[PDB]
């Protein structure tokens, strides 16, 4: 495949030298179209005050990923990678990679601009769940020990990485997509915790194995360390709401493996990698 992007504006030669320094990096693309404007290039079409992080991670799933091949003075050769063959990427993220790292793709948080971080999979996962529990704490921040937990929650320890992840709550207000994400997690936890007691009875009238017995034992330990004849349509609404608000969490519970990396250039500015995507 081949992607051609252009510029209707005018391009300074110092900006040309700035652009060819980004010789092989990843640029997201909304649709694999042969000719494209540069207003579809990068993530500057989705930045605002209100979306933040979960909208960006949910939006970069259904977008495709390219790699820049060469730079001419008025058009950039973007080359969509294919599965199986290996490629050459550049480390634009503050993380430095090692051999064998499965690389993940993530929006960078910390009249037009071009901006995405390429983080290895465990660091991406741990900052994902760190931002998640930092959004869970975000309503009751008037106390001090939860504020110390938030301050411990900001900084992550990694090889040459002292990062200050930004505060998801701002002006005592959480953004609405993080609000729906943490609400979905709280409701799937609650709905699980009160429907497994009914459905372990509503399933063990069939052939019962010992897993059902230990399941009910675990549930009675839960119910005693914490503290049935339902209408059919309310029950249907419970189960369907459980599964549909679970369905909007697939972006957060998985990790799309994108690159499998190989031998690395010195100073960790570029790395040869396979596109497993």
């Amino acid at each position: 495949a081949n992607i051609f992007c252009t510029f209707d504006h005018k391009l300074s030669i110092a900006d040309v030298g700035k652009l060819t320094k980004l010789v092989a990096a990843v640029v997201p693309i909304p649709q694999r179209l042969h000719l494209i404007k540069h207003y579809q290039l990068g993530l500057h079409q989705f930045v605002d005050h209100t979306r933040g992080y979960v909208r960006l991670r949910g939006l970069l799933r259904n977008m495709t990923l390219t790699l820049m091949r060469r730079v001419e003075g008025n058009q950039i050769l973007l080359h969509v990678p294919t599965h199986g063959l290996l490629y050459t990427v550049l480390n634009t993220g503050p993380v430095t990679w090692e051999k064998g790292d499965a690389l993940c793709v993530l929006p960078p948080l910390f009249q037009w601009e071009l901006v995405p971080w390429i983080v290895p999979m465990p660091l991406a996962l741990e900052i994902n769940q760190r931002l998640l529990i930092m959004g869970l704490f975000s309503l009751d921040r008037s106390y001090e020990e939860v504020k110390a937990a938030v301050q411990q929650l900001q900084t992550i320890t990694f090889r040459d990485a002292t990062f200050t992840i930004p505060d998801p709550v701002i002006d005592q207000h959480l953004l609405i997509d993080m609000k729906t994400a943490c609400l979905s997690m709280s409701m799937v936890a609650n709905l699980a915790s009160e429907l497994t007691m009914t459905y372990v009875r509503k399933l063990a009238l069939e052939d019962s194995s010992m897993l059902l017995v230990k399941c009910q034992e675990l549930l009675m330990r839960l119910d005693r360390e914490r503290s049935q004849h339902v209408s059919p349509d309310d029950e249907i609404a419970r189960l369907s709401a459980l599964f549909v608000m679970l369905r909007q969490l697939d972006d957060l519970i998985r990790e799309q493996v994108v690159f499998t990396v190989c031998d690395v250039s010195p100073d960790n500015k570029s790395a040869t990698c396979i596109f497993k995507g």
């Binding site: 030669i13 110092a14 030298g17 060819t20 092989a24 060469r70 040869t272």
Partner: protein
């Protein structure tokens, strides 16, 4: 670029341009000359020895 890696292609254009700015500096000197001697030359006197 040395190509001694089978697993590593460099994949660089290798024609980076650099921008170097100049600085001007004028160099002057005052240069005097007696004009009474200048009349002896620009008028080509042919009088005597």
């Amino acid at each position: 670029r040395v190509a001694s890696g089978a697993g590593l292609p460099t994949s660089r254009q290798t024609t980076i341009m650099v921008t170097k700015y100049s600085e001007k500096s004028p160099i002057t000197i005052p240069f005097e000359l007696s004009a009474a001697c200048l009349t002896y030359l620009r008028e080509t006197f042919e009088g005597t020895i």
